[PDB]
C-alpha cells in the first residue's frame, strides 16, 4: 500500500506577476504595448491591466490600493549591471518616439477590454477563449451606439491578443467583486456610458444561473413535478428568500453574482436542493441533476413530469378578428 | 468612487491598410501572392482583394471609386533611401520571372474567393474561421458544374490562407452593400455564372433570420401561441409589411439583408417584438427569447404552447392504394 | 455596372504533386519518413502514400497504373548542378543507416492509415481533422483484435501527422472508387484482415446518408407524414428501386457510396424529392429540408406530423412474468 | 486483384520512452521541469510522471515495480564522448541553483495532476485536450476546500503543459488499473484527501456508461419499450447480475471500470444486447443503437415507445397547502 503521504504546501514564494506601471505613464505604456513584440517582453497580463487603466481614469489608484504592483515581471531577466533584473515599472522603449492613439486603436482597445470585462463579470474565460460571436455582437452594438459601426468590424488591431489570461488573473484577486461593483455603479461620461451599457446587459443575473433556471422552471413548467411536496415547500421558501434579497439589494439584486456578494450563496443549489434538482431536470429535458441534500429521486421526477398541470383557461373560442388573422396563415381554429 | 471619466476618442490617425495595386498589374500581383512568404510581406487583407480583382474584371476600378487604396502597407517598413517606406502599390518581386496561372491555381483562387464572398454576404467570418464543411460542399458543387469535380478536393493551394480577415475588413466598408448588389445583379459569363450560382444560394435570406424564423413559425407552429392577441395583431402587420416590401423589391426581396438595404430593418425583431418573441420561443423549443418592447411573457407562451390549433382535416380514411403502400413499411392505418 | 467578364481557366500547368518512390524502396522510404524533419522536405501527401504502399503489398503498382508519380515534389527546390531540381523519387537520406521498423512504429503506421482510409471511404477529411474519438475507438478495437490492446493508447509515433491532406488528395483522384472496391473485396491475411474489419464497418452505407435516413424514417416514423400522397408514391418507388439495386449488387449494395458507383445517385435526394423532404424533416425534429423538385410543403409536413399512424397493436395485458419484472423497476402496468 | 498480403509485425524494437529519474531527485527534477525550455529537452510524458512522484510519496517505487524506466529519452541525442547518448536518469541542469517550490507552483502541479488523473480514471484524453471547463470547476472546488480559492484561477504556471500525452501513455500501461485502485483506496493526509475527493467523484461509475445508461432507462422510461419480452427478460438478468457484483465488490462497485477490473465486462452491451439497445434508443431520443446480438428492431422500439406505462398514481387532488404554493407561481391545479 502507498503510505498515504502527500505533497505539502510550502510557505514563501515569489512568482512572476504583471504590473500597471506609473499613473503618469499610462498612455505611453498603452501605445508601446499595442505592439506584439513589446508585449512579448512582459508578463502576459500586464498590457490588459494597462489598457484598463487607460480606459478608466482613477482605476490605476484603485488597483494600487488593491495591491496590484507597479512593476511587471519581464519575460526574460536581464543580467545588466552585475545585478539581475526580473521586473520593471516602465513598459515603453528607450526609443521614445511618443505618439498619440488613433481612433481605430482606441476602438481596438475598447474591443479587448469589452471581452476582458465580460469574462470578469461572468467569472470565466472559457467563452472568450472560444464562444466569441455573441461577444462581437455586443461590441458591434456598442460601436453603432457610438456612431462608428464600421469599427465593429474593423477595430481588430488587438485581435491576436486574447484577454483570457487577464480574465483568469483578475478573477482570482480578492478585490474582483468591488471592481465590478464600481463599474456597474459609476455614472460614466460617453463613451464609457455606451461601453458600460453592454457590460451591464451581460452582468445581469451573471453567475446566478441557479436563480434564473429556477425562475424559468417556475414560470414555464407545465408538469406536476412542481407539486412534489419537498419541491413545493422549497418553491415557497425560494420565492420568500428571493423577495427578501430583492428588498435588501434593490437595483443591485441582478448583480449579486457579478459583484461576488456573499448573499449570492443564499440562491445556490445547496440552499434549495430539491427544487434545484427539479428545475435542472426540467431544463435539461427542455433543452446528473439530483443535488447534494435532495431527497427527490429521478424516477419520481420522471413520473410526475408525465402529468400536466394547468395555468388557467383563456376562453374556448377565438374572436372573429383573431380567427381571420389565423386564416391568413392556414390555421382554422383551436383544437 | 471612480470619477466617471473615460478614455475619449482622438481625431486623426493613420493605421495600416491593405491595397489593390494597379489594374495592369492584377495578374502579376496575384501570381506573386500565391506564395505564403510573399503574402507575409504585406497587410493580410491585400491578397484577398487582389484575387477578387483578378476574379472579376471591372472590380478594381469599383474598389478605387469606393476609396480602396492602391498601396498596401508592408508587414515591415524599409528604411531604404534615408526615407522610411511603409507601403507600396506593387506586390510582385524584382526577380520578375513572370508566369501564367495553372488551372489548379485558378480553382484554388475560386475556393478562397468562394469562402470570402460567403462571409461577405452573410455578414460574418465566424463560420469561415470554423463551420467550413458546408462551404466545401458549395465549392464542390461549383467545381462539378464546371466539369472539374476532382478540383472540389484538390484545389487546396490556398488552403492555409483563410479569408477571415478580409471578410471582416470588407464587411466594415461603407460600400459593402453596393458590392454585393453588383455581384447578385450582374450577368456573368462562365465560369462566373456557376461561381455566382453558389453565392446567390447563400445570399438568399442572408441576414434576414428574423424574417425567416417568423415565416417558419407561421407555417409550422401547431400551438395556440399564434392566437395570443398581441402576437396575432403583429402577424397581420408582418404579413402586410412583408407584402409591401415584396411588391417594392421584387426579385431583390430575399437579398435585402445581403445588400445592407435600409428596408431590412423593417423586418427586425424591434418591428414585431411580440411575434418575434413567440417565434424565437417556438424555434428554440423545436430545435432569452422575449424581445425589447414585447409585452407577452414566457409564462403565457408556455401555457398557450400546450394547447393545439388545427390547420384543417384531410380525411379520416386512407385510399386503398395508400393503405397498401403503408403495409410495405409495417403501417396498418391512421390512429 | 460590372461588365460581366470573369477569370477564365488556363490550360497547362505543372503544380506540385506527391509521389510513391520506387517499389524496392518502400520500406526504406517509410522508415525515413517516420521522422517529421524528413517529412518537411517533401509534399505533405507523400508519406501517407508511401505508408499505404508499405501496408498493402501490390498497392504501389496499382497506384502507378492509376497515374500516381514516383517522384514527389520537394518542399524547397535545390539549385544543385547548374540545373534546378524540384522533385525526386527517393525520400531516404544519404546517411543510409538502414534499420527495420519496431512493433510500435508498425502500430503507429496502422493508426495513421486507419484514419486515412476512414476519410477515404466516407469521402471527407472534416471528421479526421476534428471528430476523432470515434476513430480512436475503432483503432483500439483493432489493436485488441490483434492482441496488442496497449498499442490502442501507445501507438502515437505519428500522432502529429494528421492524414487530412492525403484524404483530400486521394478523394480527388479518378481511381478512388476502384481503390476502395479493391480494399473491401480483397481477402487479406492477418493483420490486414483485422485492419479491414474496421474499415468495412465504417464503409457500410458510407455516403448513402439519404438512403439510410429514408430507411430510418420508414421504420420509425409514427406520424401521418408517411401518408401524404406524393410522399407515399415515392415510398413505393424507393423500396422497389432499392430492391432492384440489392438484387443487382448483392453484398456490395452497402458499399455503392464508398466505391463511388454510378448507381449510388439512384438513391440521392433528387430521385425522391418528396420522400427525402419528409424524412429529413422528421429526422431533424427527432434529433431547410424541402428538396429541389419536391411539391410537398413544410406547412403540410407540420400538420400531418401531428397525426399518429399505427404499426399494429400487441396485446393490452402484460403476461404475469413481465408484470413481475416491471415491479422490479417500479412499473405497475400499461397506461 | 491485390494479392492479399499485408504488412507484418516485426519483433524487437527500442522506441523512445519517458522516465521518472531517481527517488532522491524527485523534487529537484520537478523544480527543473517547471520550465518549458527544460521540458523540451525530454520525452513529453516525463515531467507528468515526475510531478506524480512528487505528489504522492511512495509512487516512484510503485512505478519502478511496474517497469517504468528511471531514464527518459532526450528530445535530441548527444554525440558526447565518442559514444551517442539517447537517454538520461537526471533532468535538472548542471547549473544547480537548487530552490524550493512556491505555493503557487504547488497548486499548479496539483492542477496539472488533477487533469491528468481525471483522464486516467475515465480512460480518455479527449476531454482534457478539449472539454476543460468542467475540469477547472473540480479544481476550483479543491482549491476552495484547501482555503486557497484564488489559486483556482491563478495557479496557471503549467497551463501550457497539457497532460494529454501522459494520459494516453499511462492508460496504455498494464498496471493502470492497480494504480487507480491504489489512489481510490489509500487514506491520504491533507491536502491529498481533498485532491482525491475530486478524483473519487469523477471515478464514480467512470467507464461504466452502459451500466448507468441502463439504470437511467429503468428509473425514468415512461414507455412500453420496457415491456418488450426480450428486453424485459434482460432487465431481470441485469438487475440480478448487478446485485451479485454489488455484493461481491461492495464500495468498489462504482469503481470497476476505473480500476479496469475484469468484472466490468459483465455489464457491457454485449452482456445485455436487447436491453442496451432499448436504453440507448431511449437515451438518444431523450437527449445506430441496435447492439450486436440483439434481436429487437428499431421499428419495434419506435412502436412501443408511443405507448405509455404507469409508475403508480399519487392522488388526484393537491393538498390545500400545495394548492396555495401553486398559486404563487400561477398554477391553478392538476390537469
UniProtKB/Swiss-Prot annotation, chains A, B, C, D:
Record's keyword terms, sorted: Capsid protein, Helical capsid protein, Host cytoplasm, Host G2/M cell cycle arrest by virus, Host nucleus, Host-virus interaction, Inhibition of host NF-kappa-B by virus, Modulation of host cell cycle by virus, Viral nucleoprotein, Viral penetration into host nucleus, Virion, Virus entry into host cell
One GO BP annotation of this record: viral penetration into host nucleus
The keyword Protein biosynthesis appears for this protein: no
Entry annotated with the keyword Transcription: no
A GO term from the CC aspect: host cell cytoplasm
Localization, UniProt: Virion; Host nucleus; Host cytoplasm
Primary localization class, coarse: virion
Pfam families (alphabetical): BDV_P40
Motif (Nuclear export signal): 101-114
Miscellaneous: Isoform P38 does not have the nuclear localization signal, nonetheless it is localized in the nucleus.
Function description: Encapsidates the genome, protecting it from nucleases. The encapsidated genomic RNA is termed the NC and serves as template for transcription and replication. Plays a critical role in the nucleocytoplasmic transport of viral RNP by interaction with other viral proteins. The nuclear export signal is masked by the interaction with the phosphoprotein P. Delays the host cell cycle progression by interacting with the host CDK1-cyclin B1 phase in late G2. Inhibits host NF-kappaB activation.
Subunit structure, as described in the record: Homomultimerizes to form the nucleocapsid. Binds to viral genomic RNA. Interacts with phosphoprotein P. Interacts with host CDK1; this interaction delays host cell cycle in late G2. Interacts with host NFKB1.
Protein name in UniProt: Nucleoprotein
Species assigned in the record: Borna disease virus (strain V)
Name of the gene: N
